[PDB]
Copies of this chain bind each other. A is one copy, B any other.
Amino acid sequence: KSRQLKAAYSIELAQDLRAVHGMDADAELSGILATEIMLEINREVVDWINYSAQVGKSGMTLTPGSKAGVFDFQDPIDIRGARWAGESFKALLFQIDKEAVEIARQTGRGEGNFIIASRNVVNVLASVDTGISYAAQGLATGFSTDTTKSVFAGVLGGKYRVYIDQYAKQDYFTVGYKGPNEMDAGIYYAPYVALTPLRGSDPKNFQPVMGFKTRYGIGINPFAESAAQAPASRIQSGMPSILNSLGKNAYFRRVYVKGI
């Protein structure tokens, strides 16, 4: 599947802009177009990871008296009777670790080894002692809590690569598994053509034009659902949809969080 963007800018603007602000107008616009395309693409991948994720803290990962899908810091069951943040934040770590195990149970490839989460979740992780200790809390240390300098925040317990979803809609974390192979991720991004510039001008009025075009393709790992014994129709699309990835991808589990 393709993507493309155009600039199509006027001459008089470039002339006046240079005269007054010193900007080129051509260079600025080509910069923007190429940049925008890559930003849009990266978001597409993240959205598919969450789209296809299973509901976490569900089924075999539930405490029977729980709310079925959300980790609530104000709920004494979810926080295991914990007090202050020093004992309570660790309860979230327990649910995270429990989710990672469930990912291994369903994928058969490995335990969740990365976390994509909201800024609030990461600040919670950064501000708590994640090792085994009575309790502890304080100013955030181990994980960047920013998004400005980097998306990658740090490694949780030396176990999970934590990234911040700078656009998290609510507040949540997704625990996911990624193997060493490009065939072991559940979600794939497979580029074919990228950022080929096209240039010209319309020979009636000579106004310059330009734009860029790409072609990628995405897909779902055979066995991503994992539970199914067999696919329908034998020869099937690997492109994600309602009938093949939504809420099914064994590589990911999304747990909502509340009470932070």
**CB within 8 Å of B: which residues of A?**
12, 15, 60-61, 63-65, 73-74, 77, 79-88, 90-91, 93-94, 96-98, 100-102, 104-105, 108-111, 119-120, 123, 126-141, 145-149, 156, 166, 171, 203-204, 206, 209, 211, 215, 258-260
Contact = CB atoms under 8 A, between A and B. Distances in A.
Contacts of A258: 64
A136 B132 contact: yes
A64 B134 contact: no
Contacts of A126: 97
B146 A123 contact: no
A104 B138 contact: no
B129 A138 contact: yes
Copies in the complex: 5
B91 A84 contact: yes
B127 A129 contact: no
A64 B259 contact: yes
Given A91-B137, A105-B147, A132-B137, 8 more contacts: A61-B120, A84-B90, A84-B91, A86-B87, A104-B148, A109-B148, A127-B132, A129-B138
A119 B146 contact: no
A77 B74 contact: yes
A136 to B, nearest CB: 5
Nearest to A118: B60
Contact of A84 (B73, B82, B141, B171): B82
B84 A79 contact: yes
Contact of A145 (B79, B97, B135): B97
